Amino acid sequence: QPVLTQPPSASGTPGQRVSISCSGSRSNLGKNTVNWYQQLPGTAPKLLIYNHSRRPSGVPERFSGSKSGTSASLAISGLQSEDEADYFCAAWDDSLNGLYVFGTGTKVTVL
Amino acid sequence: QPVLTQPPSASGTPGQRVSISCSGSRSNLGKNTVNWYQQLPGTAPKLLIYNHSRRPSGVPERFSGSKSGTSASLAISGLQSEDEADYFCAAWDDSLNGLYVFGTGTKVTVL
Amino acid sequence: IRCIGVSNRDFVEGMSGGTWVDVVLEHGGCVTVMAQDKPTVDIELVTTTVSNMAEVRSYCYEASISDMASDSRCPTQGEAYLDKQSDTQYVCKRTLVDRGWGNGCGLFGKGSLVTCAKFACSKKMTGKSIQPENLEYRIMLSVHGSQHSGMIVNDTGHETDENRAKVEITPNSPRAEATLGGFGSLGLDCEPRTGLDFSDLYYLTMNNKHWLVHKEWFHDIPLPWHAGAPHWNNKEALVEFKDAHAKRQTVVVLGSQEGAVHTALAGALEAEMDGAKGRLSSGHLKCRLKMDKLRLKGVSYSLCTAAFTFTKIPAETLHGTVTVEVQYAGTDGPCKVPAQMAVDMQTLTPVGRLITANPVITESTENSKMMLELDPPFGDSYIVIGVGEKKITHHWHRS
Amino acid sequence: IRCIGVSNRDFVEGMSGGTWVDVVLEHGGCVTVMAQDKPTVDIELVTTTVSNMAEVRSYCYEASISDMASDSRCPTQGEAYLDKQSDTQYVCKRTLVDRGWGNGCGLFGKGSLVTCAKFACSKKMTGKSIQPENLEYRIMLSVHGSQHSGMIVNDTGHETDENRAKVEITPNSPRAEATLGGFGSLGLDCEPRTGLDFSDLYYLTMNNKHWLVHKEWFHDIPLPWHAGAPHWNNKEALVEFKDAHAKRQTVVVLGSQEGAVHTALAGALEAEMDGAKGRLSSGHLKCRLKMDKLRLKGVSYSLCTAAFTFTKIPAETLHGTVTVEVQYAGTDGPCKVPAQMAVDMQTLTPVGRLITANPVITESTENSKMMLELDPPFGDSYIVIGVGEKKITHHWHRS
Amino acid sequence: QVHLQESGPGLVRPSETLSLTCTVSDGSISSYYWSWIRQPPGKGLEWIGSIYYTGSTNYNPSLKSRVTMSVDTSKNQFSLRLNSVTAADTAMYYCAGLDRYSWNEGGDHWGQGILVSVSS
Amino acid sequence: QVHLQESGPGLVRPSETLSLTCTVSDGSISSYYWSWIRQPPGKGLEWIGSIYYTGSTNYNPSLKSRVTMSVDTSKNQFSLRLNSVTAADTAMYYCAGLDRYSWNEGGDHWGQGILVSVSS
Numbered sequence A, B: 001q002p003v004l005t006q007p008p009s010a011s012g013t014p015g016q017r018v019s020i021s022c023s024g025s026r027s028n029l030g031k032n033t034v035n036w037y038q039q040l041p042g043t044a045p046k047l048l049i050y051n052h053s054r055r056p057s058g059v060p061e062r063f064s065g066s067k068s069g070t071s072a073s074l075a076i077s078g079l080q081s082e083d084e085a086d087y088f089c090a091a092w093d094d095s096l097n098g099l100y101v102f103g104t105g106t107k108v109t110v111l
Numbered sequence C, D: 001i002r003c004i005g006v007s008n009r010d011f012v013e014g015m016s017g018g019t020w021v022d023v024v025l026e027h028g029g030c031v032t033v034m035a036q037d038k039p040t041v042d043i044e045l046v047t048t049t050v051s052n053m054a055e056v057r058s059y060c061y062e063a064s065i066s067d068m069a070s071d072s073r074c075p076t077q078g079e080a081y082l083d084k085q086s087d088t089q090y091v092c093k094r095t096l097v098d099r100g101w102g103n104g105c106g107l108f109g110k111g112s113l114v115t116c117a118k119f120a121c122s123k124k125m126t127g128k129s130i131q132p133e134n135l136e137y138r139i140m141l142s143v144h145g146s147q148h149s150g151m152i153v154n155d156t157g158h159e160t161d162e163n164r165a166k167v168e169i170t171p172n173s174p175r176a177e178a179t180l181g182g183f184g185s186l187g188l189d190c191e192p193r194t195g196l197d198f199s200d201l202y203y204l205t206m207n208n209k210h211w212l213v214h215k216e217w218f219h220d221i222p223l224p225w226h227a228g229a230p231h232w233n234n235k236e237a238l239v240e241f242k243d244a245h246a247k248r249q250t251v252v253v254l255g256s257q258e259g260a261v262h263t264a265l266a267g268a269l270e271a272e273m274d275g276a277k278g279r280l281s282s283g284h285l286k287c288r289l290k291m292d293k294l295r296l297k298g299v300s301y302s303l304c305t306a307a308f309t310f311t312k313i314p315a316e317t318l319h320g321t322v323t324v325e326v327q328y329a330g331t332d333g334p335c336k337v338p339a340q341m342a343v344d345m346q347t348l349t350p351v352g353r354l355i356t357a358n359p360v361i362t363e364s365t366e367n368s369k370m371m372l373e374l375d376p377p378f379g380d381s382y383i384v385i386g387v388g389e390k391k392i393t394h395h396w397h398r399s
Numbered sequence E, F: 001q002v003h004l005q006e007s008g009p010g011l012v013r014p015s016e017t018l019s020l021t022c023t024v025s026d027g028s029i030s031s032y033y034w035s036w037i038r039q040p041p042g043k044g045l046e047w048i049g050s051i052y053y054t055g056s057t058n059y060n061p062s063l064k065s066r067v068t069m070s071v072d073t074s075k076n077q078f079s080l081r082l083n084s085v086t087a088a089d090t091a092m093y094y095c096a097g098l099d100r101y102s103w104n105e106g107g108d109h110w111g112q113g114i115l116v117s118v119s120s
Helices: C258-264 D258-264
Strands: A009-011 A018-023 A034-039 A046-050 A063-067 A071-076 A086-093 A099-102 A106-109 B009-012 B018-023 B034-039 B046-049 B063-067 B071-076 B086-093 B099-102 B106-110 C009-013 C020-026 C030-034 C041-050 C057-072 C094-099 C109-128 C135-143 C164-169 C177-179 C185-190 C201-205 C210-214 C225-227 C239-244 C248-253 C269-274 C277-280 C284-290 C308-310 C322-328 C368-374 C379-385 C392-398 D009-013 D021-026 D030-035 D038-050 D054-072 D094-098 D110-129 D135-143 D165-169 D175-179 D185-191 D201-205 D210-214 D225-227 D239-244 D248-253 D272-274 D277-280 D284-290 D308-310 D322-328 D339-342 D368-374 D380-385 D392-397 E003-007 E018-025 E033-039 E046-051 E057-059 E067-072 E077-082 E091-098 E114-118 F003-007 F018-025 F033-039 F046-051 F057-059 F067-072 F077-082 F091-098 F114-118
Touching: A009 A018, A018 A086, A034 A063, A046 A063, A071 A086, A099 E046, B009 B018, B018 B086, B018 B106, B034 B063, B034 B071, B046 B063, B071 B086, B086 B106, B099 F046, C009 C020, C020 C030, C020 C041, C041 C185, C041 C284, C057 C248, C057 C258, C094 C248, C109 C239, C109 C248, C135 C185, C164 C177, C164 C185, C201 C269, C258 D258, C322 C379, D021 D030, D021 D038, D038 D185, D038 D284, D054 D248, D054 D258, D110 D248, D135 D185, D165 D175, D165 D185, D175 D185, D308 D392, D322 D380, D322 D392, D339 D368, E003 E091, E018 E033, E018 E091, E018 E114, E046 E067, E046 E077, E046 E091, E057 E067, E077 E091, F003 F091, F018 F033, F018 F091, F018 F114, F046 F067, F046 F077, F046 F091, F057 F067
Parallel strands: A009 A106, B009 B106, C009 C030, D009 D030
Antiparallel strands: A018 A071, A034 A046, A034 A086, A063 A071, A086 A099, A086 A106, B018 B071, B034 B046, B034 B086, B063 B071, B086 B099, C020 C284, C030 C041, C041 C135, C041 C277, C057 C109, C057 C225, C094 C109, C109 C201, C135 C164, C177 C185, C185 C284, C201 C210, C210 C269, C239 C248, C269 C277, C308 C322, C322 C368, C379 C392, D021 D284, D030 D038, D038 D135, D038 D277, D054 D110, D054 D225, D094 D110, D110 D201, D135 D165, D185 D284, D201 D210, D239 D248, D272 D277, D308 D322, D322 D368, D339 D380, D380 D392, E003 E018, E018 E077, E033 E046, E033 E091, E046 E057, E067 E077, E091 E114, F003 F018, F018 F077, F033 F046, F033 F091, F046 F057, F067 F077, F091 F114
16 A cells, blocks of 8 residues: 655644645546545544545635645645644555555644 | 182083182172183173172073182083183272282183 | 447437436447436447357258269169169169160160269358347447547457446346446346347358348258258259250269359348357347446546647537547646536526536546537537636537 | 161151152251162261350459458548549449548548459359351261161271261351262252351350350359450459448458359250360251162162071060061172061061161171161061071061 | 444454444435544554445455455445454544545545454 | 273374273263273283272272273263383273172173284
8 A cells, every 4th residue: 555645744833824745656646536634632533625625614714735646735824723733644546446545644833 | 919829720521510719818709799701812701600690691590600708619510612711700809999800710621 | 439420329318317217229339328417428239149059950052972873774674773772872863765775775765764973061051040048248338538549449458447348148147237436337237038039030150151041041042951960851952964865864063052142142131250159240129227326426526727728629420519629737637627508607507418427537647638528509609618717718509 | 777766766758759858957866768769878967066166255253352442531521532443453332431530520421431352353254156157067877788786886997987977067068978888879968057046145165164055144144244355344243342330341252153153054055075176965957868879789689598597686666667686697698688577478478668678788708797677567467587498587566 | 414423342352353333324325435444542544444335345455354344235334343353453443434436515424433442 | 781892092102192981871870880901812801990980089009000090971981091001011901890899780791892002
């Protein structure tokens, strides 16, 4: 399973913009959709962005995602102290039968 | 042409019976007719016997002919002094084009 | 895209909300089946295969003879007979010939004469019965959205390619399911028993040439034939007996009838053999298609935001639709290719109907080619594809 | 003596006092002609030989193909054309195929497709005209009185045997004289110009196979043909054009028609070739025979005095006559064979008439074979041959 | 309107069979590729396996050794069993509805979660 | 009453042509194989040559060197020509109708004869 690669540490003060990378190959990002999740400890991850910057009803406008050929990006405009959490990028893979691989995770921190 | 050999001189007293031989080859007597002639000097020979012992009107019944395979004979019953002459046998030959060959001739003389 | 070009194309539309759709699949013909909120897929009957053929009856079209002998009879001695008249590999016939002193007989009149010739066949043809039980129908299904111009002529690798799938139907397992990947699966519940009565025909196999012939014509062949597995009937068709002024008799065979059969066969349905399995080129078949388990792929996708470039001339097909080939330089794919017709931009009135149901882009890489089909309404319309300020627009009109 | 036994035998008798006698000689038929105080002779037309044949029209029954080429066009763009349509060794055809995106066209309709194939003939037949000018009738003449059964079938030594002679009559020399040795000479005034119009037929030459067919049948052959001495017309008879999914066209030849013709020729008159001259087996010929110069042989002979021996069984013919084979050991030959019938052995009245008029023995050699013909009266009679106490007697009865 | 809820023993003995069920409510069981995810505390999320309503079986190759999943189309539920569980597999297990074909509005769907531990 | 009679020069000079004709009366010229015979006194008879009414030519092999014979079907006559005659050819000449096959009643027939001499 080709592991999805994320930068480890993302930081910023309130009001700044922080983007999150997620680099893959054709097997996962080159043919399938990409989903993002915000991991809070002790609870189930919540869907923020699915299907190239679409957000279900309830997800604020401050978050936005984006995918490239083999790389994906997630932009958090207007950072807040409540947005500090673990973030995972997940996408389908078109391997032997089809696997769902997660990202390495990125820590978001207020200075 | 195989030459016919005949004895040269035949003699006998009046009242005797004298036969004349006439031997030929396969080419002439084996397929054709046989004729006899009595030759008188200074004149043409006169037909005595034609076609196996038939005689035209005027030839007496005293004469009679006979043919064999390759030889011919003439029987003279009731010999007379007027019968002293040369006799020739002539018969057709089935050679190259068809020839009429005569015999060598035999002198018959009454004592 | 496999229905594009065949004249026998039918546009069937099930009821709104209904699940079953009936179609009629012909050989070489193509049916474009559509449904609301369902993808556009092509279904075509490719090959019909009949298996487990066994010999039934064999006709001879080229024969050979050897070792012939004769015998004649004197007048008033009866009819002629030879010991091989009772031998089924020989063909005889009695005639009347003049006999006398020079011939070795002591009377004048007609004498019976029989003459036989040893019959042997070198190459033969065989007709085979077609059992509807031993019958296989192969169906091919093909999905739109991918397979750029390099895939027009490409037949190797469909077992791994999710867009195309091969179906096989026999009476022991009349059901098969087509693996459609992202689009789900399509059912093909077919009724082969009520499609065309192939019971009134025969399967001819000539010297590597194969046809579908009438059973009336096949039983009417005037040639030597034998039943089952050999006992030959009608030997006189290949042999002529010319009588020679009622004195002598000759026997000769007739030349090869390869040409005489090919002339009469002009019109018959032809076929070919795939080794030991026999393929057909005629017959139709009604099937029932399930739309329930058939799924779309890409309704949640984003709209293609990047620009398009005209790669080829938009052209029309034999049925009225418009195709456009374009290249997607965008990298936000997979995306829903924005395509629609509009008479009013405020009401957004959907005119016509979309042929390529939910056109979607697969690869996010630039300079990729893709082509889709569109159905304008009769009369005036405008070809409008894309969204935003960079959409490309073209004019179009029908009739 | 060859008329003895053939069914098609006619006995013609001219009017009393007339000079002319007409006969009709047919193939396989035999005419036994008699005249008062004239010998009975048999004359039969055996073979007809036509020379100086020249080519008229040749049909091909086996062809071959190579170098097929194609060309296609879009709908309503006009017809397709290739440069070999003007090439007479090629056969082409334009058809209509459905064109669109999959084929590469942008219009609605059928597209023209033309395909040509190089014409070549593998095995061909030839028809040759039969000129009545270059036509020969060969006649054989045979006399009765001698020439026993051993002379019935004998073809070597005809230059040396005087009894047998070969006759040939052409329109260039309608008269010929038969050297007949002892029987004199017979006149033969034949009418080849008014016998049978052989102009309405053709002489076909297959692969060393030869027939005589109607000229109506020859011009109705649906096959490629060319006249005289190659420019072939009607190429479509031997070639099949297979349509391949309305995209390309393939060309194939039909099987050999050699056998199809051999079956259809059932009824046609066959012939054979003696090198370059072709002989026939049908046709008749009218002739006029001279009785003036034809003489008997043996009317002055005496009756055979020596004994006779029945060597073979006296048998009857198809017309009522009696032939007997006998041995004459006598050496007084040539002699007139005594032959007549008697119904009363006491009156010995000569009844009926001799068919072989005045039968005569030739050779004076013993163990010679001889055969003669007799015509008994209707009803009771006795076959008595010979004279004197050594004559031989046989029983016979009529009806 | 779809709602997912896990169901199963929150505590198991080691080397035993870890059996897990998952009920789907107000939703069709044939409209999703129902799957399971796990997360060891400290490590990332681990997708357990997926199963389709017809029976299409798909496992994580790293866990396919002892994973068996079943789905009942009638009762609107799908299950999960993991035999020979070790102390290291102490994680929080979730069943979630992943949209493999982008056929449903809203996309994926997730439940509430249950933490399962093994005590030695 | 048939009668044959020779006619021709009874005396000739040597190296000249010995010409002899013979007319047939009360008879068909087509009914016999008309011939010529000679006989020198002391030796045997020598058959000269034969010719048939149609034109059938036959010569003595011993005399065919310088014999040419002709027959006139119209005048019922037949002739004889002998070029380059020697003194040894002094013989008695006869015309006769010889029967080549003996098919005629009476058989052969002979004339009266003429003795011809050559003076040098």
